[PDB]
Copies of this chain bind each other. A is one copy, B any other.
């Protein structure tokens, strides 16, 4: 069998974080 293929693509960016605290 041949060698491994190329590395996978980079993952999606994470979800946005939660809303900040009250001002």
Contacts and interface: CB of A to CB of B under 8 A. Distances in A.
| SS of A interface (majority) | loop
Interface residues of A, number: 23
Q: How many copies of the polypeptide does the oligomer hold? A: 3
Interface string A1-23: 11111111111111111111111
Contacts of A17: 13-20
Contacts of A13: 10-18
Given A11-B11, A11-B14, 6 more contacts: A3-B4, A4-B7, A5-B7, A8-B10, A14-B14, A15-B16
5 contacts: A4-B7, A5-B5, A10-B11, A14-B15, A18-B19
